Curated annotation (Swiss-Prot), chain A:
The gene is csdA. CDD domains: SufS_like (cd06453). GO terms for molecular function: cysteine desulfurase activity; cysteine sulfinate desulfinase activity; hydrolase activity; pyridoxal phosphate binding; selenocysteine lyase activity; sulfurtransferase activity. Changing residue 358 to A: Loss of cysteine desulfurization. This is Cysteine desulfurase CsdA. InterPro entries: Aminotrans_V_dom (IPR000192), Aminotrans_V_PyrdxlP_BS (IPR020578), Cys_desulphurase_CdsA (IPR022471), Cys_dSase_SufS (IPR010970), PyrdxlP-dep_Trfase (IPR015424), PyrdxlP-dep_Trfase_major (IPR015421), PyrdxlP-dep_Trfase_small (IPR015422). Homodimer. Forms a heterodimer with CsdE. Cysteine desulfurase activity is increased 2-fold in the presence of CsdE. The lineage of its organism: Bacteria, Pseudomonadati, Pseudomonadota, Gammaproteobacteria, Enterobacterales.
Length: 400, 399
C-alpha cells in the first residue's frame, strides 16, 4: 500500500537546500520538479501546430492542459470538470461569486453572514457588494476555541439571510469550523455558501459533493503550483445562473455593436487568453501530488507542528493561536518585537514571517496586532523543529 | 545599437522544433532570459533565507522590484506608479470600464468604439453601457481600412465621454492616427482607452508624447509569460478610479463596518500577484532593451512585404494588410481556410485562420474569416520562401 515517505517527498523539491528551514508554506509553497520542468517545457516550445523534433513533449503539454480541469475535479470530487473555472487565484474566485452571482440577486436589507476569521479575500468583496446592493454584512463571531461559532449560526440567520461566507481553514489559527453543519444551517434558510479553501485545499481538500458546497475557491501557489492561477468550483446550476465576469474573447459567442451573446460555463466566465502556463503548471502539481496520500502527509506536518508547539510552550512568554493541532502554528513571544525575531530566525536559516496575514478582524478578536507564524508542510522534518526551537532560544537570549 | 536578426533569433530555444512559425500575433515565442528567470523563480525559495543561492535570489528580487520601471521605460511613462499589473489586456480594459467609466456614466452618455476593435476593447463597453444606460457609438473604417479618425468630429457630441481605439489592429496591422483622435477626444473632455496589445510589440506608444489616458497590453504577445498584462493610466485617472477586486494588498484597514484602500497602483491589485509573470515580463523587457525595436520591426515588416508580394502573384490572392505591417491577413478565392492551415502545418508552416476576435471588423471587410501570417524579428527570408512554396503545394491539392 501507499505509505508516506517524508524523505522521498523532500527529494522532489529543488529549492529545499537553499530554502534552509522553510516554515512559510502557508504563504506560498515550494514547487516539485514536475512543476518546474512542465513550466520550462511550456516556455521552450511553440504552442503552434508545427513540431519538427519535440512533438511528443508538445503533446504531453497539451494533455496536461486539456486534463487540468479534470484533475481539479478529482481533487475536490466535483461531479464533472465543467464545474471548474480558472481565475488569478482565490481572491478573483470570490469576487466573481460576489459580482456575478450575488450582486444581481441581492436586495436592500438582505444579509450576508461573514465569519470574523475570514481572510480579507473573503470579506472585502462582501463589504463591496453589500454597499452596491443595500445588503448588510453580518458578523459570525468566534467561539471560545477560536473557531467561527457554528452553534450560534442559527441565531444569526434570519429571513433576510442570502449568503454565507466561511473559510474552510484559517490562514492564522489553522482552525476548521464545522463546515457540514454550517452548510446545513445555511441551506435550511435557502442560502448559498462561499467556501474559502485557499488553505483547506492544501491540507484537507474538500469533497464538494459530500459537503454540498455551493462555491469553493483556492490558489495554485499555496498548492505547490504556479502563481497567477486559481480555481472557482461551483455547482453547475449556479455557474449557469451567474452573469458573465470579464468581457472579451473566448467567453463570447457572437458580437456586434448592438450587443453580444456568451458561451456557457465555464468558458462564459473566462475572458481573454488564459494563463496557460498557470493551468499547465497546476495540472502538473495535482498530477504529481496524486502519488501521495494527503491524509498521511498532513498528519506528518501536523505532528511536526505539535512537537514545535509543545517545545516552544516551555519558553517564557509564549502564546499559541493554533487550533485543532493544525500544521499552522501562529504564535507570539511577549516582550519581543516580531520583526526582530523574524530577522534573528532568518539569520539562523529559519524562514517564517510575522504580520497581519490579511486577517485584521481575526487578530482584533485575539487581542493582537499581528502574530509570528511557522507553517509546516510534508517536506519539513523533525530536525527543522529542533532548529526552530534552538534558534528561538538563542533569539530570546540575544533580544534582552 | 545595430540590430542583427541572427543574434536575435538565436535567443529563442523553441525555433528548431517550431519550424516556420508565423503566428506571433497570437502569441510570441520566448527568449532564453524569460525561460531561465522563470526556472529560477520556481527553483528557489521566495522566503527570507537563502543558504546556497543568495546571488540568484537577489537577481530575482531585482527583476521583480524593477518590473514597473521597465514597463514605464518602454512606454516613456512619467513614473512607475502609473503601471498596474493585470492578467492581460482584457482585464486591463475591463478595469477601466468598471473602475473609471462605470461610476461616471450617466444615461445617454456615449462611448465611441472603432469597428476595428478586438473584442477585448468592445465587449466591456457594451457591458458598461448596458449597466449605465450609456450607448456605444461606432467609429467606422475609412477607405484605407483604418478607423476614420477624420470622421470623429461628426461623431463626438456633448454626451461623448469615452473613446476606445486600438493602436494597432490584430488583423490588418493598421495603425490609426492616434494623436489626432486623442486631440479631438480631449477637446470634448473625453478619455481614451488605447488597446496596445499589438502596438506594444511593434511600435510601443510614447504615452506622454501621445498624451494617452489608458494603455493596455499583454505579456504573452511581448515575448513574455502568460497570465500577465499591463494597464498604464495617468496618475490622476488611476487615483480617480474606484477599487477593482477586493481583498488583501489593495486594502489599508478592514473591519466589519467597511474598509479603506491603498493608493494606485496597489489599490487596483488585490490578492497575491502573479509574481512569476511579473518577473518573467521584467526579464523579457530587460532583454528586449538591448535591441533597437525600429530595426527589428523594419526586418519583420520587410519579410511580410516579400511574402505579400510573392503571394500576390498567385491566382485568387487577397490581402487585408495595412501600412506594410508585419501582420499579413489574407485569403485565397475558392479555398477552405482550415484546409490550408492544416496542409501548411503538414509542410512545416505554423499560421492560423478564423475571426481573430474581431467579428465586427470582418463583417465590415465582407468576410467570415481570414488566414493570418504574422512575422517577428526571429523570422527569416527562408521562412518567407517556405511559406510561399507551401502555399503553392497547398493550392495544387485544393484548387
Ligand atoms: C492565501 C489565502 C487567500 C488568498 O489567495 P490569493 O492567491 O492571494 O488570492 C484567501 N484566503 C486564505 C485563507 C488564504 O490563505
Ligand atoms: C491579443 C489581443 C488582445 C487580447 O489580449 P489577452 O492577453 O487575450 O487579454 C486584445 N486586443 C488585441 C488587438 C490583441 O491582439
Amino acid at each position: 500500500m501507499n505509505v508516506f515517505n517524508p524523505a522521498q517527498f523532500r527529494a522532489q523539491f529543488p529549492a529545499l537546500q537553499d530554502a534552509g528551514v522553510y516554515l512559510d508554506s502557508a504563504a506560498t509553497a515550494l514547487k516539485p520538479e514536475a512543476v518546474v520542468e512542465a513550466t520550462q517545457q511550456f516556455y521552450s516550445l511553440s504552442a503552434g501546430n508545427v513540431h519538427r523534433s519535440q512533438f511528443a513533449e508538445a503533446q504531453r503539454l497539451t494533455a496536461r492542459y486539456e486534463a487540468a480541469r479534470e484533475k481539479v475535479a478529482q481533487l475536490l470530487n466535483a461531479p464533472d470538470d465543467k464545474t471548474i473555472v480558472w481565475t488569478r487565484g482565490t481572491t478573483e474566485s470570490i469576487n466573481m461569486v460576489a459580482q456575478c452571482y450575488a450582486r444581481p440577486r441581492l436586495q436592500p436589507g438582505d444579509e450576508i453572514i461573514v465569519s470574523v476569521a475570514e481572510h480579507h479575500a473573503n470579506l472585502v468583496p462582501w463589504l463591496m457588494v453589500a454597499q452596491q446592493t443595500g445588503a448588510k454584512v453580518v458578523k459570525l463571531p468566534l467561539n471560545a476555541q477560536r473557531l467561527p461559532d457554528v452553534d450560534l449560526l442559527p441565531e444569526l440567520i434570519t429571513p433576510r439571510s442570502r449568503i454565507l461566507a466561511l473559510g474552510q481553514m484559517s490562514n492564522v489559527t489553522g482552525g476548521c469550523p464545522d463546515l457540514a453543519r454550517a452548510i446545513t444551517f445555511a441551506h435550511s434558510a435557502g442560502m448559498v455558501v462561499m467556501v474559502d479553501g485557499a488553505q483547506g485545499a492544501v491540507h484537507f481538500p474538500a469533497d464538494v459533493q459530500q459537503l454540498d458546497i455551493d462555491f469553493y475557491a483556492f490558489s495554485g501557489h499555496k498548492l505547490y503550483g504556479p502563481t497567477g492561477i486559481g480555481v472557482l468550483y461551483g455547482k453547475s446550476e449556479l455557474l449557469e445562473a451567474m452573469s458573465p465576469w470579464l468581457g472579451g474573447g473566448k467567453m463570447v459567442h457572437e458580437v456586434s455593436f448592438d450587443g453580444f451573446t456568451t458561451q456557457s460555463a465555464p468558458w462564459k466566465l473566462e475572458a481573454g487568453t488564459p494563463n496557460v502556463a498557470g493551468v499547465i503548471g497546476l495540472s502538473a502539481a495535482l498530477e504529481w501530488l496524486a502519488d501521495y496520500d494527503i491524509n498521511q502527509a498532513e498528519s506528518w506536518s501536523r505532528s511536526l507542528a505539535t512537537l514545535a508547539e509543545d517545545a516552544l510552550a516551555k519558553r517564557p512568554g509564549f502564546r499559541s493561536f493554533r487550533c485543532q493541532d493544525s500544521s499552522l502554528l501562529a504564535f507570539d513571544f511577549a516582550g519581543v518585537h516580531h520583526s526582530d525575531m523574524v530577522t534573528l530566525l532568518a539569520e539562523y536559516g529559519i524562514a517564517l514571517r510575522a504580520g497581519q496575514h490579511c486577517a485584521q478582524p481575526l487578530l482584533a478578536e485575539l487581542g493582537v496586532t499581528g502574530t509570528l507564524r511557522a507553517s509546516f508542510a510534508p517536506y519539513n522534518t523533525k530536525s527543522d523543529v529542533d532548529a526552530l526551537v534552538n534558534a528561538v532560544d538563542r533569539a530570546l537570549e540575544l533580544l534582552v
